[PDB]
Amino acid sequence: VLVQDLLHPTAASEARKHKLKTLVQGPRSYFLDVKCPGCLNITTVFSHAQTAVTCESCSTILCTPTGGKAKLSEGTSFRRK
Amino acid sequence: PKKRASNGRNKKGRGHVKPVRCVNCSKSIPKDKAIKRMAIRNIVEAAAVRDLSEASVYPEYALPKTYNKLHYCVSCAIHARIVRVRSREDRKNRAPP
Amino acid sequence: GWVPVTKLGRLVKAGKITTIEEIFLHSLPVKEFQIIDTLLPGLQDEVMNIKPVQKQTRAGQRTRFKAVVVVGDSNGHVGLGIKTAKEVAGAIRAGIIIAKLSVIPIRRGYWGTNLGQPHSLATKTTGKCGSVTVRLIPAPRGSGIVASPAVKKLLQLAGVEDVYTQSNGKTRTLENTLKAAFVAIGNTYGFLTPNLWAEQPLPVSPLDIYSDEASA
Amino acid sequence: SLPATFDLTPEDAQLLLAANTHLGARNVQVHQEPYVFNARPDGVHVINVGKTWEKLVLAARIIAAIPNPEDVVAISSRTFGQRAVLKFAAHTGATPIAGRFTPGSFTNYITRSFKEPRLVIVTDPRSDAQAIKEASYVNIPVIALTDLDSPSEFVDVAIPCNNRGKHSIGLIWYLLAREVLRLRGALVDRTQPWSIMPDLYFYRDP
Amino acid sequence: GKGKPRGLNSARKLRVHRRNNRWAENNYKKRLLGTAFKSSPFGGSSHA
Amino acid sequence: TRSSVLADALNAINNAEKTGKRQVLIRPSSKVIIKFLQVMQKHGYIGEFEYIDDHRSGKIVVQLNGRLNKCGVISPRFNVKIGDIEKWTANLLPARQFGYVILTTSAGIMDHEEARRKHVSGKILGFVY
Amino acid sequence: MENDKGQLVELYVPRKCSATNRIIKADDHASVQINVAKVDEEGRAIPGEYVTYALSGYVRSRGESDDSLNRLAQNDGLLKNVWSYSR
Amino acid sequence: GRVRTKTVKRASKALIERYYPKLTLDFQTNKRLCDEIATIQSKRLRNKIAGYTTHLMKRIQKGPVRGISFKLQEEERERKDQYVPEVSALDLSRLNVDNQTSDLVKSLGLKLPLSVINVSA
RNA sequence: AUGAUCAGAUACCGUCGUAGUCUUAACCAUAAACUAUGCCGACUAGGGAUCGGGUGGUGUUUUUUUAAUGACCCACUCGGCACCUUACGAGAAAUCAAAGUCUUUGGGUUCUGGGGGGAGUAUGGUCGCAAGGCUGAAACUUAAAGGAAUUGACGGAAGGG
Ligand SMILES: [Mg+2]
Ligand SMILES: [Mg+2]
Ligand SMILES: [Mg+2]
Ligand SMILES: [Mg+2]
Ligand SMILES: [Mg+2]
Ligand SMILES: [Mg+2]
Ligand SMILES: [Mg+2]
Ligand SMILES: [Mg+2]
Ligand SMILES: [Mg+2]
Ligand SMILES: [Mg+2]
Ligand SMILES: [Mg+2]
Ligand SMILES: [Mg+2]
């Protein structure tokens, strides 16, 4: 193609790219607030965590680290903050 | 001139590939350059098949096979009509016939 | 006579087309030499050399003659033809036909100050055939064509009065150096310059004004 | 611009989606094709038939601009389009070339099959590549009944269509013939349909 | 970057490279070693 | 590694104008790139360009018309006196009537003909025709 | 190009490609000049009344003639929804 | 071998291009009308051109033979080619779609009788 | 050392067989050590496979019929070993997605070459127990030596008629 708008790519085509190869680079990660079984104790956890994040009230470990996104434990209720 | 883009072997990213011996002349050849064929044959060669089938103590018998992987140097494979010389345009064909 | 077979040949025989600028403007492919010597009756030719080529055979060498011809009229147009033949006279005759078929225009210009008529080329321009590269540089007035003899006669036949030339490669290969110089003067109408920047109304083709003066 | 009777009617849309002209290629897609509208969970893509209608009426405008209608040339070496270009050549002044395009028909001015067209229309650019390749030697525009995976080099107007199907190729040639006769004025009724059935342009087995 | 250095302070490298590669010639090497004065029968004169 | 962001910009513009494209994305968008593009734009060789502010260096999207044959850089930035301008223009411009040698003088970045009007010289950056 | 007192010289001011603004040379045998017929209020094409597009051999060999002709036709109003700037 | 040469096979096909409505599927009548209407210097060559022209006609009774183009033959083939098909195969009097065809036609701003079926992978 | 072949055959073929082949501690520092393509950076065509990681898909399959998993499938992306097609381009061509963006010649930097021999030779250093390695000429001699393709002729090369 020889004529195209480089300043206004479509939303789909920007979502297809790598995070550094977009127009302005930005993270595709996010934060979550996770609530642990029992005590309410909302806590914010990074999406690609690298640490075994636990709530301050009890050892009720909320996520396990993996190569990419953290695996949230099974009885947990998250909202994408 | 350079005759083949692959240098007559298959080696892209090693530097060294440990060699094998030709089954016909005991020449040392790299394993990627060799002419590997796989000779799968019944043992009884289809002319003695009726005589052994009626000579068996068993009915329904298997008539088993021999399996061999033959490794050929370039000289012996060309001399034994396994591969032969092809035209310049027809060297680039990698498919079997 | 001629009894042409092309739409363009019928138009040029009828007198609808009175210049070859219309052919160069609409990029009409010429395939009949009578069009060229009708629309440019004043071009005069010159045969550059005759060298013998040889094909080996069962007993000896089949030999043929290669003749290089340059036609041109001395303001704006040149053609180059090269033909191999069994006979030298056939090679020269057919080379004159081929050289007439390949006639292209030349953009002459000024080295400065636009006072008289255009004496020199408009830009530096290059061409390449084989290893040979010929470059052509605009020269002041009275400089003459500074070139080796073959490409000097080609630039004389184009209508250039003065140009500096630089070569590269096996320039003793005469056919390659003539084709390189031919490409170099063909590129003069290829370079886009600020006087050419303004837009044009894209005129409609003579093949559709005069569409019923074709065969049917 | 156009008087808005040239919009895609529901009758013509019924014809298009009946013939499966929308059913484009497989996930092979030449990158020169923005004509595709979505995709099917199958892996087969869907063509935007509105764009097919707009490209078809543009090609009809291009065909109608030619002064002498014998200067239009229609090519189909595929059997599914031979009857189509013969019927298009019947209903319009165009000369057909059905079957073999002998090379040197656009070049080689002493050949017996020598044409000098002002526009050439092919059925498949891949199979009819000899015609478009010679047309690039003598300054001739090319209109092609393109698919989503066709080799669009030296094609100037590409009408996107399913050129794997029998009914689609014939329907595209039929609609093209109908539109050039409507613009020429042989069919004065722009809104009323044609007495010629689109089934006339179809391939038959023997 | 075409071989040779191009920096604005890189004249020394270019000079010494040109001297070293000037030794590869025939006439330069002959004139600077002075083989005509040493290993020629005429000793560098035209006649004898 | 990247030594000359201006050279990379001009090479990208040249590849775009060879391919026939009407636009090109330049990364990473220095000041000298802006001033070079402003010189090309005033003579009518590019058209509109826009500076995208990411927070790292910037990018630029230039719009290309069909008028540019070759924009180049001259590396290194040789020191150029006033007779040197006329030898440089004779060496690397196609004719004596068009094309500009761009050179950074102490009164800003300009082309060679405006430098002749101001009677100022400097270092050579590139060329445009 | 002109001399010191008008008198246009440089015979054959050439055509330029409608897509890339490039000069169509005298031997660009791949280049074409599209004529699209004009319509007036009845559905019928007027003979000799065209909108004209020159396309150079370069963009035709690269395969991008069809998109260039789409954008040129849609800009002139003779297409409605074929070409998209946001690609 | 009795394979005919160019001269026989070339003159005969030229002869059929311009004299197809006169000549017939009988060698004898064929060998008489060529003898006036063309010049052949020998009787033996006249007998082979007429003999192959008689052979080619029988081939023409059943379909087209390659290498002849006279305006008559294709036009008669053009004439008997309608077949006048009972009902247009495209038309369903009593159409089917996938979901993507359905939202395509809803994007076009057209309302038309549709039956949506899922076409799954 | 031997037994054949042969005009000869201390070569090819056969039977034995020392050093070696293996390993530890020291040296040696060369190979058609090859992709005969230095490294870093940017841009310029498509395509389908595969290897490693990630993301998405109410996707198949296994297991606690439902779950994560694991293995597959589809789409995308990053990095890799490569391959296929064009020829924008390049080239003397063979060919090359780099060997392109190179007379319209300047992104950074290192190394090497300047007709064929004599010659990787003499000589002097320097490393090594040695074998040798690394640096490395000249006198003199010569009008070609060479590269890639073409057409013939031939082949104790392969097919066909
Ligand atoms: Mg060899
Ligand atoms: Mg190795
Ligand atoms: Mg020179
Ligand atoms: Mg510096
Ligand atoms: Mg010497
Ligand atoms: Mg021995
Ligand atoms: Mg080496
Ligand atoms: Mg690199
Ligand atoms: Mg992956
Ligand atoms: Mg990959
Ligand atoms: Mg790898
Ligand atoms: Mg050789």
Swiss-Prot record, chain A:
Keywords on record: Cytoplasm, Metal-binding, Methylation, Ribonucleoprotein, Ribosomal protein, Zinc, Zinc-finger
One of the GO biological process terms: ribosomal small subunit assembly
This protein's record includes keyword Electron transport: no
Co-factor: note: Binds 1 zinc ion per subunit.
Zn-finger (C4-type) residues: 36-58
Location of the protein in the cell: Cytoplasm
SUPFAM superfamilies membership: Zn-binding ribosomal proteins (SSF57829)
Keyword Ribonucleoprotein in annotation: yes
Processing and modification events after translation: The N-terminus is not modified.
GO cellular component, one term: cytosol
UniProt-recorded Gene Ontology molecular function terms: RNA binding; structural constituent of ribosome; zinc ion binding
One Pfam family in the UniProt entry: Ribosomal_S27e
Annotated TM spans: none
InterPro entries: Ribosomal_eS27, Ribosomal_eS27_Zn-bd_dom_sf, Ribosomal_zn-bd
Modification S-methylcysteine occurs at: 39
Cofactor(s) the record lists: Zn(2+)
Other facts: Present with 43300 molecules/cell in log phase SD medium.
Subunit-level organization: Component of the small ribosomal subunit (SSU). Mature yeast ribosomes consist of a small (40S) and a large (60S) subunit. The 40S small subunit contains 1 molecule of ribosomal RNA (18S rRNA) and 33 different proteins (encoded by 57 genes). The large 60S subunit contains 3 rRNA molecules (25S, 5.8S and 5S rRNA) and 46 different proteins (encoded by 81 genes).
Family (UniProt): Belongs to the eukaryotic ribosomal protein eS27 family.
UniProt-recorded name of the protein: Small ribosomal subunit protein eS27A
Organism: Saccharomyces cerevisiae (strain ATCC 204508 / S288c) (Baker's yeast)
Gene, per the UniProt record: RPS27A
UniProtKB/Swiss-Prot annotation, chain C:
Main location: cytoplasm
Designated name of the protein: Small ribosomal subunit protein uS5
SUPFAM superfamilies according to UniProt: dsRNA-binding domain-like, Ribosomal protein S5 domain 2-like
Subcellular location, record wording: Cytoplasm; Nucleus, Nucleolus
Gene3D superfamilies membership: 3.30.160.20, 3.30.230.10
All copies of domain S5 DRBM, residue ranges: 43-106
Post-translational modification: N-terminally acetylated by acetyltransferase NatA.
Quaternary structure note: Component of the small ribosomal subunit (SSU). Mature yeast ribosomes consist of a small (40S) and a large (60S) subunit. The 40S small subunit contains 1 molecule of ribosomal RNA (18S rRNA) and 33 different proteins (encoded by 57 genes). The large 60S subunit contains 3 rRNA molecules (25S, 5.8S and 5S rRNA) and 46 different proteins (encoded by 81 genes). Interacts with snoRNA U3. Interacts with MPP10. Component of the ribosomal small subunit (SSU) processome composed of at least 40 protein subunits and snoRNA U3.
Family: Belongs to the universal ribosomal protein uS5 family.
GO cellular component: cytoplasm; cytosol; cytosolic small ribosomal subunit; nucleolus; nucleoplasm; small-subunit processome
Native organism: Saccharomyces cerevisiae (strain ATCC 204508 / S288c) (Baker's yeast)
GO annotation terms (biological process): cytoplasmic translation; positive regulation of translational fidelity; ribosomal subunit export from nucleus; rRNA processing; translation
GO-annotated molecular function: small ribosomal subunit rRNA binding; structural constituent of ribosome
Coiled coil start-end: none
From Swiss-Prot, chain E:
Family membership noted in the UniProt record: Belongs to the universal ribosomal protein uS12 family.
Protein name: Small ribosomal subunit protein uS12A
PTM annotation, UniProt: The stereochemistry of the 3,4-dihydroxyproline has not yet been determined.
Any further remark recorded for this protein: Present with 10600 molecules/cell in log phase SD medium.
UniProt subunit comment: Component of the small ribosomal subunit (SSU). Mature yeast ribosomes consist of a small (40S) and a large (60S) subunit. The 40S small subunit contains 1 molecule of ribosomal RNA (18S rRNA) and 33 different proteins (encoded by 57 genes). The large 60S subunit contains 3 rRNA molecules (25S, 5.8S and 5S rRNA) and 46 different proteins (encoded by 81 genes).
Protein's job: Component of the ribosome, a large ribonucleoprotein complex responsible for the synthesis of proteins in the cell. The small ribosomal subunit (SSU) binds messenger RNAs (mRNAs) and translates the encoded message by selecting cognate aminoacyl-transfer RNA (tRNA) molecules. The large subunit (LSU) contains the ribosomal catalytic site termed the peptidyl transferase center (PTC), which catalyzes the formation of peptide bonds, thereby polymerizing the amino acids delivered by tRNAs into a polypeptide chain.
UniProt subcellular location: Cytoplasm
Lineage of source species: Eukaryota, Fungi, Dikarya, Ascomycota, Saccharomycotina
Shown residues in whole-protein numbering: 2 to 49 of 145
Curated annotation (Swiss-Prot), chain G:
Known role: Component of the ribosome, a large ribonucleoprotein complex responsible for the synthesis of proteins in the cell. The small ribosomal subunit (SSU) binds messenger RNAs (mRNAs) and translates the encoded message by selecting cognate aminoacyl-transfer RNA (tRNA) molecules. The large subunit (LSU) contains the ribosomal catalytic site termed the peptidyl transferase center (PTC), which catalyzes the formation of peptide bonds, thereby polymerizing the amino acids delivered by tRNAs into a polypeptide chain.
Main location group: cytoplasm
Subunit-level organization: Component of the small ribosomal subunit (SSU). Mature yeast ribosomes consist of a small (40S) and a large (60S) subunit. The 40S small subunit contains 1 molecule of ribosomal RNA (18S rRNA) and 33 different proteins (encoded by 57 genes). The large 60S subunit contains 3 rRNA molecules (25S, 5.8S and 5S rRNA) and 46 different proteins (encoded by 81 genes).
A biological-process GO annotation: endonucleolytic cleavage in ITS1 to separate SSU-rRNA from 5.8S rRNA and LSU-rRNA from tricistronic rRNA transcript (SSU-rRNA, 5.8S rRNA, LSU-rRNA)
Family matches, as InterPro entries: Ribosomal_eS21 (IPR001931), Ribosomal_eS21_CS (IPR018279), Ribosomal_eS21_sf (IPR038579)
PROSITE patterns attached to this UniProt entry: RIBOSOMAL_S21E
Gene source species: Saccharomyces cerevisiae (strain ATCC 204508 / S288c) (Baker's yeast)
Keyword rRNA processing in annotation: yes
Modified-residue entries (N-acetylmethionine), positions: 1
Any GO CC annotation of this UniProt entry: cytosol
Single GO MF annotation: structural constituent of ribosome
Keyword Cell wall biogenesis/degradation included in the entry's annotation: no
